[PDB]
Amino acid sequence: TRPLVIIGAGPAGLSAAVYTARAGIPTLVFGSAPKVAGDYDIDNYFGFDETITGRELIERGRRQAERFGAVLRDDRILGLHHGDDGGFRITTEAGETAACAIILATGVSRVRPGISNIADYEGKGVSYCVSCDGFFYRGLRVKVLGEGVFAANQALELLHYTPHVSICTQGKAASITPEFMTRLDEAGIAVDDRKIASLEGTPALSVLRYEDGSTEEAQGLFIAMGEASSLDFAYTLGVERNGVFLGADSDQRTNIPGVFAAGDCTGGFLQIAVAVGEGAKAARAAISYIKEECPF
Ligand SMILES: Cc1cc2nc3c(=O)[nH]c(=O)nc-3n(C[C@H](O)[C@H](O)[C@H](O)COP(=O)(O)OP(=O)(O)OC[C@H]3O[C@@H](n4cnc5c(N)ncnc54)[C@H](O)[C@@H]3O)c2cc1C
Ligand SMILES: [Cl-]
Ligand SMILES: [Cl-]
Ligand SMILES: [Cl-]
Ligand code: NA
């Protein structure tokens, strides 16, 4: 089992990776280019008296982490679960892997579902965590909302509870890879790009209303838009939330041992300067955690 995985390759995850790798801990970082990493002027990050682009600042962060031995991977994470037993099981598009300690640095970027009355059906049909709520919809007709590999994997997990699963990409282009498409086809899980306008049903969800005015029956709607997010991981790990953010103490510890959180996903002042300090503090906490708990 690896001692440490960092999920996130923005300022928080990279600042943390620099510190952990310098302390001699084999460091594996998962993440892709953050949203800030484009042609945007950064002018308020300490130490840069001349304008630097987000793309270039992040690129220097990456070279900095690699300089001290951090390995950076572009793999998207699909799920995080407590391992059986001990440490954490990390689901990626490529397969599985495992880690003794996790630093969550996945930011707050989120594809939104775009359903006018979705809030009316929270707890009554609309769910998020499959391991959490899947059993309640066993044998039932369940729709997964989302366009990506995350949606595809959530749909496949749902098969543990019901054979009656399909995916709606909510008007978006699907970005499901051919390997996942194969798996969906083999399982009889259909994918279409219809757009759900609203939900219907009187004690609970029973009908999806498409922007057409056409309808489909479903008693379960699992939201899985875009990429798996900090909230999605929180649901499966049992990490306590603070509104839409992860709860973290001043040392970036969550309520789950071995799980730390840093950057935008702990939501205060959503800035590079802030993320870089949280990443550093998370690293310090992880390093001492690993020394007591994870031999390597
Ligand atoms: C255009 C733009 C301009 C900005 N301008 C400024 C500015 O001038 N000054 C300033 O201080 N701040 C600015 N910000 C805000 C600043 O970028 C953020 O506060 C900062 O990047 C937070 O860093 P982070 O590491 O917490 O998250 P992010 O930068 O969002 O990075 C999150 C990381 O998580 C990874 N990730 C997420 N989900 C997964 C997954 N499922 N699997 C694998 N990896 C995943 C992402 O790929 C990314 O690598 C700007 C942001 C944007 C977008
Ligand atoms: Cl700056
Ligand atoms: Cl143990
Ligand atoms: Cl209702
Ligand atoms: Na924060």
Author numbering: 3 to 298
List sentences from the manuscript.
Within each TR monomer, reducing equivalents are transferred to Trx from NADPH via a tightly TR-bound flavin adenine dinucleotide (FAD) and a redox-active disulfide (CxxC motif). Enzymatic and structural characterization of DvTRi clearly shows that NAD(P)H does not serve as electron donor for the FAD while DvTrx1 was identified as the substrate.
The crystal structure of oxidized DvTRi was solved at 2.0 Å resolution, with one physiological homodimer per asymmetric unit. The electron density of FAD is well defined with an occupancy close to 1 and the isoalloxazine ring of FAD is planar. In the pseudo NADPH-binding domain, the signature motifs VxxxHRRDxxRA and GGGxxAxE required for NADPH binding are replaced with the VxxxTQGKxxSI and the GEGxxAxN motifs, respectively. The only basic amino acid in the motif is lysine 174, which is well superposed with arginine 176 in EcTrxB. However, it is not sufficient to stabilize the phosphate group of NADPH since its binding requires seven salt bridges with three arginines in EcTrxR. The absence of crucial residues in DvTRi required for the binding of NADPH excludes the possibility for the enzyme to physiologically use this reductant, which is in complete agreement with our biochemical data. Whatever the crystallization conditions were, the different structures we solved from crystals 1 or 2 showed an unexpected unique conformation of DvTRi, that differs from both FO and FR conformations observed in EcTrxB structures. The structure revealed that the two active-site cysteines (the CxxC motif) are far away from FAD.
